[PDB]
Design a protein around this nucleic acid. Structure first.
Ligand SMILES: Nc1nc2c(ncn2[C@H]2C[C@H](O)[C@@H](COP(=O)(O)OP(=O)(O)[C@H](F)P(=O)(O)O)O2)c(=O)[nH]1
Ligand SMILES: [Cl-]
Ligand SMILES: [Cl-]
Ligand SMILES: [Cl-]
Ligand SMILES: [Mg+2]
Ligand code: NA
Ligand code: NA
Ligand code: NA
Length: 326
DNA sequence: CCGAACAAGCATCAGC
DNA sequence: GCTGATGCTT
DNA sequence: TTCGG
């Protein structure tokens, strides 16, 4: 982390604009700049040097000059002093509490972890579970635990139906030594873009992982997206593992390669890649890549039989998962 | 100077 | 009930 | 907040 000081500052700024200002474009601006600086292979010596990077403009450049001279940013130090900003920012760290609910809670004087705990009746289901495991969800997952969780998920999915295919994606598939959560892509041959032959395809998997006490809680759940909580089982007299966020996405089997591209990320990589696709004349989502007309209407899906087909279409060299950690 | 800035599933609410 | 917009999250 | 045209 050559420029860890600068990238923390920018991330803290991005969080401020998102949670407090509700200014999504400033937030994306700071996050993109933090990501382009994180991969820049030199120790930045001036904001002018940084401004050579795309995504670093005038305003971020002078902020980087301030930080390099003084080690601090006055704007951030003030935001830290402000109670309402500190409280809104804190509350948004509970899963299911966003900037709107956080500001509304603060209006009602709900302002701290203890405030939340004494007001659970005021939370929806998701927020209640986010508060429940608030400490656990901020711990990272060593890759060695991701490997145990993977082995549980793939083996339980195998017992439901041998034709399911479960792929762990996210930072794990990018080779990260620790992950914030576990992301599981699910396919089954009965579910394609053309037909859904079996019902409750995701349900059955959720139910099987609940019954072996791997999945502990549910945050949200539909026919194709499960968001919930899991916990590794511990040995006799060992202390429990933390609970962990798990996301499961059932994708049409014929659309796996778009699905695994989407779910491997990163989120910023996805944004950068889908943006460039537009410039090249395509739109990419988790299902398809399609040409755009002159009007701006998506045409029919183009054929895809590997991740790299998608890169080819928009004329990018293939980048292995490991190199998509923007 | 001005428009664009990735794409979408689920929970929840308002309005009919 | 349904539709559509918003919040929140991936 | 930054970029491209
Ligand atoms: N197009 C688009 N895709 C998004 C977005 N947010 C998450 N994704 C994608 C890609 C992720 O890696 C993936 C999982 O979402 P994630 O929040 O688990 O991200 P991640 O890459 O796994 C993190 F590094 P970690 O989980 O380890 O803290 O889903 C988004 O805003 N737009
Ligand atoms: Cl904005
Ligand atoms: Cl600072
Ligand atoms: Cl599509
Ligand atoms: Mg993840
Ligand atoms: Na720049
Ligand atoms: Na939150
Ligand atoms: Na996730």
């Amino acid at each position: 982390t050559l420029n860890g000081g600068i990238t923390d500052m920018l991330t803290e700024l991005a969080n401020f604009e998102k949670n407090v200002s509700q200014a999504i474009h400033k937030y994306n601006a700071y996050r993109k700049a933090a990501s382009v600086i994180a991969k820049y292979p030199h120790k930045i010596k001036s904001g002018a040097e940084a401004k050579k990077l795309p995504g670093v403009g005038t305003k971020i450049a002078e902020k980087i000059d301030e930080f390099l001279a003084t080690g601090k940013l006055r704007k951030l130090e003030k935001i830290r002093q402000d109670d309402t900003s500190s409280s809104i920012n804190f509350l948004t760290r509970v899963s299911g509490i966003g900037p709107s609910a956080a500001r509304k809670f603060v209006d009602e004087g709900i302002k701290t972890l203890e405030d939340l705990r004494k007001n659970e009746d005021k939370l929806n289901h998701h927020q209640r579970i986010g508060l429940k495991y608030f400490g656990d969800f901020e711990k990272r997952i060593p890759r060695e635990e991701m490997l145990q969780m993977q082995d549980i998920v793939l083996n339980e999915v195998k017992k439901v139906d041998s034709e399911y295919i479960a792929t762990v994606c996210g930072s794990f598939r990018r080779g990260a030594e620790s992950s914030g959560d576990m992301d599981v892509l699910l396919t089954h041959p009965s579910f394609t873009s053309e037909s859904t032959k079996q019902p409750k395809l995701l349900h059955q998997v959720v139910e099987q992982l609940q019954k072996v006490h791997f999945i502990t809680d549910t945050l949200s759940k539909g026919e194709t997206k499960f968001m919930g909580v899991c916990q590794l089982p511990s040995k006799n007299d060992e202390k429990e593992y933390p609970h962990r966020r798990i996301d499961i996405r059932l994708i049409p089997k014929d659309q796996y390669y778009c699905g695994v591209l989407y779910f491997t990320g990163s989120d910023i990589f996805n944004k950068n890649m889908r943006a460039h696709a537009l410039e090249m004349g395509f739109t990419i989502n988790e299902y398809t890549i399609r040409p755009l007309g002159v009007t701006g209407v998506a045409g029919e899906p183009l054929p895809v039989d590997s991740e790299k087909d998608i890169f080819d279409y928009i004329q990018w060299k293939y980048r292995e998962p490991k190199d998509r950690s923007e």
